[PDB]
Design a protein around this ligand. Structure first.
Ligand SMILES: [Mg+2]
Lengths: 244, 84, 91, 208, 59, 233, 266, 199
């Protein structure tokens, strides 16, 4: 039985929700209703199996390579990502960005400062993520940050399941080349499961699903919601997520 | 039908039979001899086989049953004797 | 070519496992390789030399119950019917 | 006050060994997540601290397996606990002023001392030409063999000095000494020479 | 194939059986002994099969 | 083995040793075992009721209880042979436990053999923690399996929503079919969406089976060629 | 924290050990995000978080598989009273009798530990070492899991006489006093012996009988109840049931030890 | 009471099955329930059965007959193959209605193999999947039969067999081919008759 995690200051979040991003009704939709929905669906899908004993992150890491249980993976991914998202918008466990994170953004993004990087992430979310999706700021094994976007329920950890390219429409030839090299990397591995190593981790997570913003911000104006999320993050969690 | 043996002093095979695999050199020699029997000695047809033999025996001319142990180990468990 | 005993044939419509395409499957199949078992009376089959002959050797020796696999009752009736067939001039 | 046995394994066959393996298992169990990547005490040495006469070689092999597993943990992630527990169980030639490598080899009762310098393949034996001292071609080829294994024949000058035994013994002593001298000029070739069989003394000798 | 037929019909053993005379009590004793040995062999084969299966499964 | 006296009377032997003076100091267990007497009765106990189905053991219906004729049309006037036999063994045998579900289950996996292929976990988790309302088939903390169908059938019959076993079984079966169709559609659509959004899969079930078949077939190739060579000579 | 580790330069990528520490930091903080797992059985907890004797229900005993008895063909008829019935070719153990006997045995273990007696946990099946060791450590007791040497009790001088002994205070604190050879060579006899597989340990049971050592055991359907002082009807061939019962007994012993220490510290 | 809980226990949930574990006859559908154990319980040999399974077994799936026997062994087999076949069928996508509205023992429609509905097609980034292609192995030199993804089917040819067939002879099963599943039907006895075409 997967159960919705308890959140600090739950009474205040019920009363008002996350300040300056969501109202109480919106926070109910994004977390109290959607997280319960996802957890119940995962429990129904994985009950009576081994996967009931593993956490959603270990579930999605286990299930990433098997086509026929993608649904479980999707649920697991959401159940993880949503919580990550919530944790970077919780009022508290004003928090300030750390020196190390600022240095990494400055070094990772070709000298660009953090705020223009925020605007660039807003642009990326507006452009590529058509409809439901997730936005992440992630660090790779080279100690380099970069911006990743996943369509529907995708994971930053495993690059085969990043779901960063929307094939329903066309794809740029460069995106096709990226897909082909990715598939070659997958195929090179000698493991029977076909697994590959990916040490990417999410430092920032933003929920672009309609549950997050539609009730508070409408069909349009999603970039407004993303800007509000990024401006008022809980920087203690974000700083802790980085390793030194 | 099922036959149940009495409580026996032991459970052992007198002569365990092992599946030694016939040496490759011997069978290759036999094939060569049959070749020269049918086509003839130093016949063009099967001369290739000779080459194989020349290699197969070049280094050397010719190039285990645990049933009793396991039976003795397991007999007390599987004999199905009455309690005491 | 492969001798037929050395090849395993999966019948049509049957499920299988990768083990099936193995010599172990053939060896296992080798290892684990009518009317009188249907509730009938063998004594009634005493003027029927063919069905009685199904249960004897080439020389006419009645087959043991270990070979026939019949019940003791039907085995006794079969032996009696075969001997009666021998006596009456049939078989 | 109360008298009780010291070890939790007191009623086992070898309580000392069981308790020591229990400590090793405890450490191997607490730090199971750490990735991985010098002899140990002898059987009598472990017998003294363990079961003594009760100590068994399988128990000793189990101890060594655990100790090797613990040591094989990556050094950069080891800590003071593992090292402290493991500590209880722990038991160059060069050329001369003239650029010469000096080696001494033996074979049967023959001994040879060889000076190998960089040169053009010239060889002297006891101040005599090689062909004058060694009439047998096989002995000359034996002397050549270590030079041609490293394909440096014609790149060194050899001054060999033999004494004792007969022709073949002296020649093979020159061979072994030349190999030992060549190892100095390029240590990376030692394995190559060692694989050719010229760096191992032929211990065979006349017996009563 | 002919020799196989002969051994399946027990003709060779039968001929040596009829060669000399055997008292009916001794005949019954031998028949009981042979049947008991056959049954014992069947039981021993069953036990060996159980042993081999248990070994395969790791017992 | 005989019922053993010495195991349970250790306290009495130790008391004799202590009072005689043979033993000077009381063992640490003496006071504890005195406070907690061992159970010293080893008796075969009669059983009069089968818990699984409630059948009452040890009851005979007397002649007077039948004032009417039986199915064959005969009045019971004297006891018959079976009635005149003492049945103590029936009391002292452990009763066989029989459940109605055991039948329906056997039916279900006969009707749906491939449902057996779906793996089952027999590790119990916690039995007492189950809090299920069987007005609906799906339960949180439970898989969707045939046992859910039998449980819904028993719930239907218990509430008398349906009268006969077959009717409730069929209704639960149809609910099962609907739910399993929904799950199958989720799986298919999820895989299609993953491929739609760029997900790349290293290996699939067909290719995995093909790989295992290839290893087995290569070993079989070597063994067959060697065996043909062996048999030819 | 992690001595003798050499961090990498910012220009170069992470090292393998740096990646390991980074992933450890991730695991201890964020890997467990999304849901909290409830009502799921984790085997290790049966050893580390056993329930108290009073909190045990029949449902908990049945979940551990304690009720599953031996095959009906291997029945020892002396165990008739402990049997609830037979089902699927095996005998079912009556779990109410199991609960009563287990509570009684837990009280016995708690009393013996509270009196400072020696408790010996003997179990010689394959995977029983972990639970035996943990029970002995938390009860300040002793255990055997490799093999029971015959004569360990009746011939203690020739078996256990050579191993060292130790004087301790009321608080189980070493005194480090030097023991005389006669004191070191005395028999030290267990005050309580608990056997997980009494069928394969007849020697230990007979020695305890001869030496007047009260004994507890898990009595399966094919085991003799009268060979032990405090039988516990239950399944002895399943590791889960054995570990559950052993953890209950070990927690009772730990409670007795804690009561003893609390009284000595007042 | 204890009887109710035993009736609802997972060991009771497994239906009574006593068929031979080692079966050499024709196999059309699963005959034993697959028992799965988690890795954590496998580490301790706990499978939820009466007794501990031997530590030699490394697979997490088995099929069993007796919890206990006179020989003190659990009558089991370390095999979980059949599920994969079922799952592999789901990869084929070929659909096969009794699932829409005294006890009868006939196999009801598809007995849990596939609960899909015929009227759907697969979208792919290349586009609509018109025809489904899966790899298989032609087994014998005979119609010709093929082992395709856990099931044996009769392959419908297209003009002549490729010459590779004649060249290889009885070693034909060594080489993989690509087939398109024309149709899948279920016979009364439970066999799954599929017709495929060698491309
Ligand atoms: Mg047992």
């Amino acid at each position: 039985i997967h159960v919705v995690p308890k959140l600090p200051n739950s009474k205040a979040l019920l009363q008002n929700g996350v300040p300056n991003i969501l109202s109480s009704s919106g926070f109910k939709t994004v977390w109290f209703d959607y997280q319960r929905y996802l957890c119940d669906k995962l429990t129904l899908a994985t009950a009576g199996q081994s996967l009931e004993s593993y956490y959603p992150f270990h579930i999605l890491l286990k299930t990433a390579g098997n086509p026929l249980q993608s649904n479980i993976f999707n649920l697991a991914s959401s159940i993880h990502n949503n919580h990550l998202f919530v944790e970077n918008i919780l009022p508290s466990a004003k928090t300030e960005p750390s020196r190390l994170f600022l240095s990494k953004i400055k070094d990772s993004f070709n000298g660009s400062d953090w705020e223009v990087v925020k605007e660039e992430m807003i642009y990326r979310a507006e452009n590529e993520v058509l409809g439901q999706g997730w936005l992440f700021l992630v660090e790779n094994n080279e100690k380099k940050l970069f911006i990743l976007t996943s369509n529907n329920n995708g994971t930053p950890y495993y690059f085969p399941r990043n779901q960063s390219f929307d094939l329903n429409s066309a794809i740029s030839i460069d995106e096709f080349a990226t897909l082909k090299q990715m598939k070659e990397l997958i195929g090179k591995s000698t493991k029977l499961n076909g697994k590959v190593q990916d040490w990417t981790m999410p430092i920032i997570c933003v929920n672009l699903w309609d549950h997050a913003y539609l009730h508070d911000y409408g069909v349009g104006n999603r970039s407004k919601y993303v800007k509000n999320v990024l401006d008022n993050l809980n920087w203690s969690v974000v700083n802790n997520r980085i390793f030194s | 039908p099922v036959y149940r043996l009495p409580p026996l002093p032991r459970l052992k095979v007198k002569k365990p039979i092992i599946r030694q695999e016939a040496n490759k050199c011997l069978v290759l020699m036999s094939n060569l001899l049959q070749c020269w029997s049918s086509y003839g000695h130093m016949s063009p047809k099967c001369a290739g086989l000779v080459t194989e033999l020349k290699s197969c025996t070049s280094e050397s001319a010719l190039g285990k049953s645990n049933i009793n142990y396991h039976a003795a180990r397991l007999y007390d468990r599987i004999n199905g004797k009455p309690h005491d | 070519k492969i001798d037929q005993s050395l090849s395993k044939k999966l019948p049509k419509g049957t499920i299988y496992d990768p083990f099936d395409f193995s010599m172990g499957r053939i060896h296992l199949d080798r290892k684990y390789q009518d009317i009188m078992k249907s509730g009938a009376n063998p004594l009634e089959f005493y003027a029927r030399p063919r069905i009685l002959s199904r249960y004897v050797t080439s020389t006419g020796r009645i087959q043991h119950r270990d070979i026939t696999g019949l019940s003791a009752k039907n085995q006794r009736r079969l032996s009696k019917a075969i001997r009666r067939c021998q006596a009456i001039g049939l078989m | 006050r109360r008298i009780v046995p010291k070890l939790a394994t007191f009623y086992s066959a070898n309580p000392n060994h069981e308790d020591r393996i229990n400590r090793l298992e405890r450490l191997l169990r607490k730090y199971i997540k750490l990735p991985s990547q010098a002899p140990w005490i002898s059987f009598d040495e472990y017998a003294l601290i363990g079961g003594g006469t009760k100590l068994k070689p399988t128990q000793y092999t189990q101890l060594l397996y655990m100790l090797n597993k613990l040591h094989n943990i990556d050094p950069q992630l080891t800590n003071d606990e593992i090292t402290s527990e493991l500590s209880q169980y722990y038991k160059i030639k060069t050329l001369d002023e003239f650029g010469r490598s000096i080696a001494v080899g033996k074979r049967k009762s023959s001994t040879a001392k060889v000076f190998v310098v960089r040169g053009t393949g010239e060889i002297l034996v006891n101040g005599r030409q090689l062909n004058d001292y060694f009439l047998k071609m096989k002995d000359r080829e034996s002397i050549m063999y270590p030079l041609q294994v490293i394909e440096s024949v014609g790149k060194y000058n050899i001054f060999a000095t033999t004494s004792g035994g007969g022709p073949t013994g002296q020649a093979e002593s020159i061979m072994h000494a030349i190999a030992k001298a060549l190892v100095v000029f390029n240590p990376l070739l030692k394995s190559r020479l060692h694989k050719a069989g010229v760096l191992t003394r032929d211990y065979r000798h006349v017996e009563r | 194939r002919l020799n196989r037929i002969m051994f399946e019909n027990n003709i060779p053993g039968d001929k040596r059986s009829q060669r000399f005379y055997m008292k009916p009590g001794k005949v019954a004793e031998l028949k009981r002994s042979q049947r008991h040995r056959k049954e014992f062999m069947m039981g021993f084969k069953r036990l060996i099969e159980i042993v081999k299966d248990a070994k395969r499964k790791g017992y | 083995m005989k019922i053993q006296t010495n195991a349970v009377n250790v306290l009495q032997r130790t008391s004799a040793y202590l009072k005689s003076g043979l033993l000077k100091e009381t063992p640490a267990w003496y006071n504890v075992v005195a406070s907690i007497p061992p159970s010293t009765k080893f008796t075969r106990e009669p059983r009069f009721k089968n818990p699984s189905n409630g059948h009452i053991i040890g009851k005979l219906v007397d002649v007077t209880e039948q004032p009417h004729a039986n199915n064959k049309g005969l009045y019971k006037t004297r006891p018959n042979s079976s009635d005149k036999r003492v049945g103590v063994k029936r009391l002292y045998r452990p009763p066989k436990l029989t459940y109605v579900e055991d039948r329906l289950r056997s039916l279900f996996y006969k009707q749906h053999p491939w449902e057996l292929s779906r793996p089952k976990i027999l590790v119990e988790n916690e039995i007492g923690d189950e809090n299920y309302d069987w007005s609906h088939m799906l339960q949180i903390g439970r898989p969707l399996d045939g046992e859910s169908v039998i449980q819904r059938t028993m719930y239907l019959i218990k509430t008398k929503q349906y009268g006969d076993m077959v009717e409730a079984y069929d209704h639960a079966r149809y609910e099962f079919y609907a739910l399993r169709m929904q799950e199958e559609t989720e799986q298919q659509v999820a895989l299609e969406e993953a491929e739609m959004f760029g997900s790349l899969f290293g290996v699939s079930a067909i290719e995995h089976g093909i790989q295992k078949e290839q290893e087995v077939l290569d070993v079989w190739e070597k063994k067959v060629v060697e065996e043909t060579e062996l048999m030819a000579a | 924290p992690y001595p003798n580790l050499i961090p990498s330069a910012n220009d170069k990528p992470y090292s393998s050990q740096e990646l390991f520490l980074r992933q450890l930091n991730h695991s201890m903080r964020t890997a467990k995000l999304g849901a909290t797992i409830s009502k799921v059985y984790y085997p290790h907890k049966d050893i580390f978080y056993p329930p108290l004797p009073e909190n045990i229900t029949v449902e908990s005993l049945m979940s551990a598989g304690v009720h599953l008895g031996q095959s009906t063909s291997l029945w020892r008829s002396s165990t008739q009273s402990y049997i609830y019935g037979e089902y699927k070719g095996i005998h079912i153990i009556d779990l109410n009798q199991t609960l009563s006997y287990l509570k009684r045995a837990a009280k016995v273990v708690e009393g013996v530990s509270e009196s400072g007696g020696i408790i010996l946990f003997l179990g010689t099946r394959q995977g029983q070492k972990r639970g035996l060791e943990e029970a002995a450590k938390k009860t300040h007791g002793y255990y055997v899991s490799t093999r029971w040497i015959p004569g360990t009790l009746t011939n203690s001088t020739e078996i256990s006489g050579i191993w060292e002994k130790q004087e301790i205070d009321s608080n189980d604190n070493p005194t480090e006093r030097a023991l005389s050879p006669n004191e070191t060579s005395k028999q030290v006899k267990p005050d309580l012996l608990v056997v997980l597989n009494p069928t394969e340990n007849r020697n230990a049971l007979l020695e305890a009988i001869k030496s007047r050592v009260p004994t507890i055991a898990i009595i399966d359907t094919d085991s003799e109840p009268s060979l032990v002082t405090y039988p516990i009807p239950g399944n002895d061939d399943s590791l889960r049931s054995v570990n559950f019962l052993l953890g209950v007994l070990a927690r009772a012993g730990q409670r007795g030890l804690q009561n003893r220490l609390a009284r000595n510290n007042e | 009471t204890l009887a109710e809980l035993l009736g609802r226990s997972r060991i009771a949930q497994v239906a009574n099955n006593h068929k031979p574990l080692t079966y050499t006859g024709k196999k059309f559908h699963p005959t034993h329930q697959i028992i799965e154990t988690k890795p954590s319980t496998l580490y301790r040999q706990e499978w939820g059965l009466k007794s501990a399974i031997p530590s030699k077994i490394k697979s997490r799936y088995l099929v069993y007959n007796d919890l206990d026997t006179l020989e003190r062994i659990t009558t089991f087999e370390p095999r979980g193959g059949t599920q994969w076949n079922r799952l592999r069928f789901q990869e084929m996508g070929v659909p096969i209605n009794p699932f829409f509205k005294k006890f009868n023992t006939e196999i009801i429609g598809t007995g849990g193999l596939s609960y899909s509905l015929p009227g759907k097609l697969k979208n792919s980034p290349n586009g609509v999947i018109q025809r489904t292609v899966v790899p298989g192995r032609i087994l014998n030199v005979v119609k010709w039969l093929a082992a395709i993804g856990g099931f044996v089917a009769d392959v419908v040819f297209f003009q002549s067999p490729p010459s590779s067939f004649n060249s290889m002879g009885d070693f034909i099963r060594m080489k993989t081919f690509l087939f398109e599943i024309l149709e899948a039907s279920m016979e009364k006895n439970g066999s799954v008759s599929m017709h495929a075409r060698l491309l």
